[PDB]
Amino acid sequence: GNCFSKPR
Amino acid sequence: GPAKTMEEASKRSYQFWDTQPVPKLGEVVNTHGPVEPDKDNIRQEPYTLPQGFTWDALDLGDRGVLKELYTLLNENYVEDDDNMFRFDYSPEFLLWALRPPGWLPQWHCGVRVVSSRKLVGFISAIPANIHIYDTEKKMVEINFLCVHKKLRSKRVAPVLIREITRRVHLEGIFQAVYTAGVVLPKPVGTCRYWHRSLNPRKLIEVKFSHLSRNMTMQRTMKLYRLPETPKTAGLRPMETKDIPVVHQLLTRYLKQFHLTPVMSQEEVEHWFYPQENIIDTFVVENANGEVTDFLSFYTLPSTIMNHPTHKSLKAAYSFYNVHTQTPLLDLMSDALVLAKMKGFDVFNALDLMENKTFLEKLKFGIGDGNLQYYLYNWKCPSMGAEKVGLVLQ
Numbered sequence: 498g499n500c501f502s503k504p505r
Numbered sequence: 506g507p508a509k510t511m512e513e514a515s516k517r518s519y520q521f522w523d524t525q526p527v528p529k530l531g532e533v534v535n536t537h538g539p540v541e542p543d544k545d546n547i548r549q550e551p552y553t554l555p556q557g558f559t560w561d562a563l564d565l566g567d568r569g570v571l572k573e574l575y576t577l578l579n580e581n582y583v584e585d586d587d588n589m590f591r592f593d594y595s596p597e598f599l600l601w602a603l604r605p606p607g608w609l610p611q612w613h614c615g616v617r618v619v620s621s622r623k624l625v626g627f628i629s630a631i632p633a634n635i636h637i638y639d640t641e642k643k644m645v646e647i648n649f650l651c652v653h654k655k656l657r658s659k660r661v662a663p664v665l666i667r668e669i670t671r672r673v674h675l676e677g678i679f680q681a682v683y684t685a686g687v688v689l690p691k692p693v694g695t696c697r698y699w700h701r702s703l704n705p706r707k708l709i710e711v712k713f714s715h716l717s718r719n720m721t722m723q724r725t726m727k728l729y730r731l732p733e734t735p736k737t738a739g740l741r742p743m744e745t746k747d748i749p750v751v752h753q754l755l756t757r758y759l760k761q762f763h764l765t766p767v768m769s770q771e772e773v774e775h776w777f778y779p780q781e782n783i784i785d786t787f788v789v790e791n792a793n794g795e796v797t798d799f800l801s802f803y804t805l806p807s808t809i810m811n812h813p814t815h816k817s818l819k820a821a822y823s824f825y826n827v828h829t830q831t832p833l834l835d836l837m838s839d840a841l842v843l844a845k846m847k848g849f850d851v852f853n854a855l856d857l858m859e860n861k862t863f864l865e866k867l868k869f870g871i872g873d874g875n876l877q878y879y880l881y882n883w884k885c886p887s888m889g890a891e892k893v894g895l896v897l898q
């Protein structure tokens with residue numbers, strides 16, 4: 498599946 | 506427990522993946538080819554599920570079945586590291602991702618509770634021709650592996666993987682490609698997500714992004730402001746007449762990467778023809794009437810969990826961007842403007858293909874999520890992100 502990223 | 510880092514991955518044993526035809530996490534891969542030969546006979550019986558659960562192929566043409574799948578994913582699919590956001594794939598998006606040309610109903614592999622018929626598990630495969638270094642192979646792409654929260658840590662996911670493998674083997678296919686936010690044996694490439702704020706006040710309010718201590722909200726607004734309309738001459742939405750040239754441009758552009766899709770003209774139509782709130786494609790038609798570039802991005806919103814006011818985040822995801830006459834930087838700048846125009850809160854892109862040439866310049870910030878790329882039953886050397894030329898959903 499995809500992965501949910503957010504700004505470091 | 507899952508491993509998001511290679512450090513935490515090195516200290517883990519993989520009871521399931523050790524049984525599978527993938528390389529071990531430790532080894533360096535020196536060869537090219539299948540891990541094991543194609544199977545001459547395939548198990549005819551579906552794998553056994555824990556008592557009280559049953560397999561059920563999902564006909565996504567049935568609106569109510571599609572809505573059950575929407576709900577399973579909306580409540581149980583992928584979340585960020587801090588359990589603040591969850592993917593919210595729309596029903597129409599799921600139809601796009603799960604019914605490309607060649608899709609098979611048995612490859613929409615559901616798990617249901619026998620008594621209540623509640624959908625509690627899912628995995629999918631779609632066919633795809635994959636170019637990996639010097640080899641072109643018919644493969645499947647695996648996506649949407651999901652186990653209901655009440656059902657986790659009961660080794661249901663290994664059963665889902667084996668059952669879809671079985672159903673794919675029955676069609677004579679023995680390799681697959683897939684991504685994951687966790688480290689598994691063994692990534693062929695590791696990509697990093699980057700994020701370009703479009704509505705930075707909302708992003709900061711919902712804690713998707715954080716205001717730096719050395720920056721005010723007012724400076725953050727100015728830093729991310731964009732023009733009102735794109736700058737590229739002749740940019741316009743893709744139309745039916747552009748399908749052949751978009752196919753041609755994409756095919757030629759992808760040859761420079763080492764992991765890419767090989768799309769028929771019908772697959773180009775499926776993946777790029779614009780569908781509102783699913784997939785946007787814009788072409789550059791020049792002064793001679795010739796299409797020389799295109800940009801595309803898909804729509805993937807997310808649920809903001811446990812928040813009283815803001816309930817959803819609208820995200821655009823960079824898909825494929827092909828430049829032959831327009832600089833890639835101008836192309837992506839116009840993509841940002843178009844996404845902002847369409848109401849998106851953030852524009853996401855990976856560091857694959859040539860994306861590193863524009864990420865810092867267009868004010869993307871690096872994300873906390875890696876996307877690992879994997880191949881099943883194919884040994885080959887790993888590659889840098891810039892040679893990965895494959896985007897899934």
Ligand SMILES: CC(C)(COP(=O)(O)OP(=O)(O)OC[C@H]1O[C@@H](n2cnc3c(N)ncnc32)[C@H](O)[C@@H]1OP(=O)(O)O)[C@@H](O)C(=O)NCCC(=O)NCCS
Pocket residue numbers: 498499507518519520521522523581582583584649650651652653656657658659660661662663684685686687689
């Ligand atoms: C990911 C998910 C399906 C795993 O199910 P689970 O019940 O927590 O884990 P299980 O008890 O069933 O079994 C774990 C096995 O599956 C593996 N596994 C865990 N997550 C995996 C993933 N995303 N992809 C492939 N294999 C995975 C584990 O590594 C382990 O195998 P191992 O012994 O070799 O290490 C489940 O947590 C889920 O639905 N998460 C939200 C959606 C999601 O993350 N989907 C996958 C995106 S790649």
Ligand SMILES: *C(=O)CCCCCCCCCCCCC
Pocket residue numbers: 498499645647648649650666669670673674678679680681683684685881882
């Ligand atoms: C994200 O949803 C991807 C999860 C991938 C799970 C493992 C898939 C392994 C390949 C199975 C199919 C093999 C067919 C030859």
Ligand SMILES: [Cl-]
Pocket residue numbers: 563564565566604609610613
């Ligand atoms: Cl279907």
